[PDB]
């Protein structure tokens, strides 16, 4: 029932290889729905999910206007930050920005976000109050002063409490058949001997949405945190996600081990064991 929208901007300079690339992508939860890329042959905002396609040409043009303006603005910001850090014109640098709104299960604004980073390090973030900034260092303090002068926090607050929430709600309704459908994981446990003395139990979760899941192994009902190999949740490429967790167990203590699976799509949490 809990939903979010985010935009992710990446601006990357590349001295000697033309002007900085700007790319923006938009997500509702784990579903990407829009992209814009200053490097594309003809840069325009493009749909990346079926439910956004129904938006009319005035939506597409509005987005495209915004991201074109951002392309130019970020090129200036890259120049400025290079200066703030006394950096040479030789190196590539990246500004990243992620912002957006969280809704609770009732559809109300839980909180808003707007954070920027420079070469992968926190640089400036809007505080949870949506009215003040946290600047990481003396360079970011310069941006902070600029943004206070432009009344940025007040404008973001209005967006995050207003348009962000309204459009998220619209998208959730238009895409309700996928965005508000939780697909439970399909699960199974595999067993492969590693030697005479030990075997790997691997607990699989496939085909689930959204990406959030808990996979644990227990021995005698106690968590095996330090002994579980736990792979990053990965996209299947069809909107769904995959994950596995593995423990190496003594032969044949296999029945002492249980895999536990929590996910929104399940009627009830699962307890699985290896089934010879």
């Amino acid at each position: 029932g809990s939903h979010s929208m985010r935009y992710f901007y990446t601006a990357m300079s590349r001295p000697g290889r033309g002007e900085p690339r700007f790319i923006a992508v938009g997500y509702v939860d784990d579903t990407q729905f829009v992209r814009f890329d200053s490097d594309a042959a003809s840069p325009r905002t493009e749909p990346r999910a079926p439910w956004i396609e129904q938006e009319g040409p005035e939506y597409w043009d509005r987005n495209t206007q915004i991201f074109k303006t951002n392309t130019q603005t970020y090129r200036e910001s890259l120049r400025n930050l290079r200066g703030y850090y006394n950096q040479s014109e030789a190196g590539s640098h990246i500004i990243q920005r992620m912002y957006g709104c969280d809704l609770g299960p009732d559809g109300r604004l839980l909180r808003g976000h707007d954070q920027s980073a420079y070469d992968g390090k926190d640089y400036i973030a809007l505080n949870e109050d949506l009215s003040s900034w946290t600047a990481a260092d003396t360079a970011a303090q310069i941006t902070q002063r600029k943004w206070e002068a432009a009344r940025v926090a007040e404008q973001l607050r209005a967006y995050l409490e207003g348009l962000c929430v309204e459009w998220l709600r619209r998208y959730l309704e238009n895409g309700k058949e996928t965005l508000q459908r939780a697909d439970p994981p399909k699960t199974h446990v595999t067993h492969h001997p590693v030697s005479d003395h030990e075997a790997t139990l691997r607990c699989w979760a496939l085909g689930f949405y959204p990406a959030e899941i808990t996979l644990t192994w227990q021995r005698d009902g106690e968590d095996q945190t330090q002994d579980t190999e736990l792979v990053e949740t990965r996209p299947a490429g069809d909107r769904t996600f995959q994950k596995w967790a593995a423990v190496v167990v003594p032969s044949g203590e296999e029945q002492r081990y249980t895999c536990h699976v929590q996910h929104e799509g399940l009627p009830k949490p699962l307890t699985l064991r290896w089934e010879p």
């Binding site: 509005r62 991201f67 130019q72 603005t73 200036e76 600029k146 432009a150 404008q155 967006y159």
Partner: peptide
């Protein structure tokens, strides 16, 4: 829909 104001850092 994205935020519409740009501001140089």
């Amino acid at each position: 829909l994205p935020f519409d104001k740009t501001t140089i850092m």
